[PDB]
# Entry
Amino acid sequence: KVVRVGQIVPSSNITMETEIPALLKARELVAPERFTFHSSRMRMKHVTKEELARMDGDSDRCALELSDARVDVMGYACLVAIMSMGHGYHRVSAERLRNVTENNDAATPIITSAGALIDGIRALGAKRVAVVTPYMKPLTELVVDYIRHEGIEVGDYRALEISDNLAVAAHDPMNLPGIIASMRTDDVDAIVISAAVQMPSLNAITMVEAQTRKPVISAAVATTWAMLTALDLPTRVPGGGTLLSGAYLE
Amino acid sequence: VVRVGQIVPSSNITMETEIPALLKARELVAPERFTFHSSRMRMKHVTKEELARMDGDSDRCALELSDARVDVMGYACLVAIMSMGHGYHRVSAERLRNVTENNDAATPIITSAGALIDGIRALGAKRVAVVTPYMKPLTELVVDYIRHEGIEVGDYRALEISDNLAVAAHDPMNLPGIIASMRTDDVDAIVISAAVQMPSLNAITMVEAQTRKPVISAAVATTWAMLTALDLPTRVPGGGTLLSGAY
Amino acid sequence: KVVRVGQIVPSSNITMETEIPALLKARELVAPERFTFHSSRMRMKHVTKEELARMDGDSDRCALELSDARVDVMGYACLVAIMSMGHGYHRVSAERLRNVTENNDAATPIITSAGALIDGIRALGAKRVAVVTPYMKPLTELVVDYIRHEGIEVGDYRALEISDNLAVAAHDPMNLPGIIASMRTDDVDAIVISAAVQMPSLNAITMVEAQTRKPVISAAVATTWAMLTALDLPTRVPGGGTLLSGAYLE
Amino acid sequence: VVRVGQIVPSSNITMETEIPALLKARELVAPERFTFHSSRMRMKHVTKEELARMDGDSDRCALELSDARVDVMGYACLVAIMSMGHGYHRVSAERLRNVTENNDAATPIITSAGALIDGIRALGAKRVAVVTPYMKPLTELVVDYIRHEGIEVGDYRALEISDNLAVAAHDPMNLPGIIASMRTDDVDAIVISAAVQMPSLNAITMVEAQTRKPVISAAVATTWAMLTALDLPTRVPGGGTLLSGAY
# Structure
């Protein structure tokens, strides 16, 4: 049984195409489904409001491109691009993209990273969250405010202020445990190790869970959780942290 | 980690299937690991006009993929290249490379058309039998292109499936039977699939056993050519003669 | 880089040869080392004191068999067989087996499941532990007393009382979360989901960690941790629970 | 889940390497998953006497593995079986099966000796070239055994390595060169390794490409024969002609 996964990714993004396949490859050790990966790109090189807004404009084209392949699920990878567009935009985006696929004769469940993160946090039953991002400070503020608007408290948060998206990919994930250690996490229900999909975090997730004893999620992890759930499949993925423990089928 | 870029028709699913499968197999025999990154050019129906329009979008795709500083790029659609005119695989690869260089990330560009020709030559094969999924006029162009490159063509078959997604649904286990119904004794190598879109991977060894001749597909040729472009050994289990390790 | 793993297993044991390769297969997704697996068998069909004592007598033969292959590490799989022989026997067994390999011209690091479990608990810094076993009650008592003797408190423990070793293999690991739920685990530092190496538990480990928010280990997990550490290799294994999070190189 | 039992000489490491590798490759093309379980019979030096003593321990191994209710058993050592006398692969398999039945767990028993002969026959090969790692007198016995089974032997080579663990250290990439120095034109198939202990897996496709003849090893034969004993399809990528899917 083969599942075709479609990914709408920023052109300069390399991490979504690394971590989502890594996770699902691990899942193949544990469950019979096999996965193939199919991408469409929307141009962005620098994570600024202007580039984000322009990139999102290519959204429809990308969904047309991937529904031409009759992909079984489609994930819009960039969390901040969705949240940058204003409150509740993750719903707008998902519904519009679904319509685009439906009118291309291949209705597909649509996941956005932004929506997946919110849904994953709710599935965990987490009420308060700590958040690490790689974004410039204003963008990070928007994200935190978006999460708060969705009824999820935000405690400590950190912004690495790296706008060059290729430089974001170059950030050492082994720095992340020390960053999280220097944040308050005792008053938090879950830790968002990366709100961004470009910043690698997968290889630090289990370490951080061990160190903090809190559930750790990332935009990438939440997205795969949401894709799996949208396909009515078990969500147990080795190395994917608490959300992918197998205990959560929300 | 090696970053592989894939420029694919929107309806193409088999390049993103067989190339990862091959490279995953390679990870078992060699230390390199691969990640895969795609950009799409829209096309549902494989006609002369649509192929030309889609190729016009090639450049955007190379731009998008070089934003991610990919280590190689493979252009999936064989017939698109061969449809544009004689020798076009060279012109395309050059123009696409220039795009990546102007985007501050010059990268080697492989077309499945060029890869098949180079693969055939690497095999030392002078004469070839070919299976395609294309409509008859288009496979006439493909055969003529191959012949223009100094490679003789014996028996060839066209499945005449213009619906590109439908091409990927063709059962690879049909391919040995198709080949068995063709003359292959006057041939040095068998092109089991001239199209990356038509799956053939699981049929390659069977056909090699049945015919006792080296068998290649556009998909294994592309894999071979991308590996060679990165100066990497080309031993891949289950990839047939071209990926023997021998070359 | 290939690592030859040797396993001394009860003849009727199937789970050690399932979970240790499963774990190390997952590790191959994350680290460059590749593993091959080589077993020697010591006969046992029923987990009784008499069968355990007889089985342990074949110990030297098994170590000779595996050192003929110049295995890079050697694990004695059966936890209860070691503990059944009296306090401190895990040290005796490891040193004797090492000597056997050394005199067979292939000195090998030796791990026992029993010793690995104790070392893994200490590596976690866990002081008090809850324990599930499949053994008959007297044998379970010995194990708990062995752990206590090693300076590790035992709170709640459960014994499934299944002595047919093939029946132990047939125990549904999805029963384990409910068993652990009906034990007190708030006053415990870590949960031993299986003290036995025959009872499957790997596929329930991450679920139980999510449900309890405590580190979960098994004899199988502790053994692979100990084998990896003995080979000076990182201990990050996807799906292997807290001990294999990558945070513990004791 | 399919439970595979392996009866191996203590110093044998390659059966537990190539059989898992092959079956892992199969998991990519077929739904079955495999676990591996071994029992050992002591032996360091491959001599007539030691082979006989080690074979005397076969029964214990079958007993130990049937305690775990394994779905098949493969006896690794080809020369041990062929050394005991003509037709011994049948006697051994039968005696070992009876052991498992008396242990309330009757299981199909494959010997690498029987598997190679059955594999050669399944290929339709009448005449064969053979490479062995054994000392000359022992490979004389092996060749004579094969000839007694109705399979002609052309060119054969003996590497004369009596240290069994050392056999596994022989570079498989030496094998194409060894074969290239042998006559293979008067042969229907090539036994690239008559010993499971001598690795050959990574050389199979290369030799098939170089010689244009089906290539089998005792290790792929054993894998083929165990799969057939469980009525499972025998398509395994990278396993050469016998594991083509064709048979």
About this structure: Strands of chain A lie at 2-10, 34-42, 73-76, 110-112, 128-133, 153-159, 190-194, 216-218. Chain A has eleven helices and eight strands. Chain A touches chain D through one residue (CB under 8 Å). Residues 68 and 250 of chain A are 29 Å apart (CA to CA).
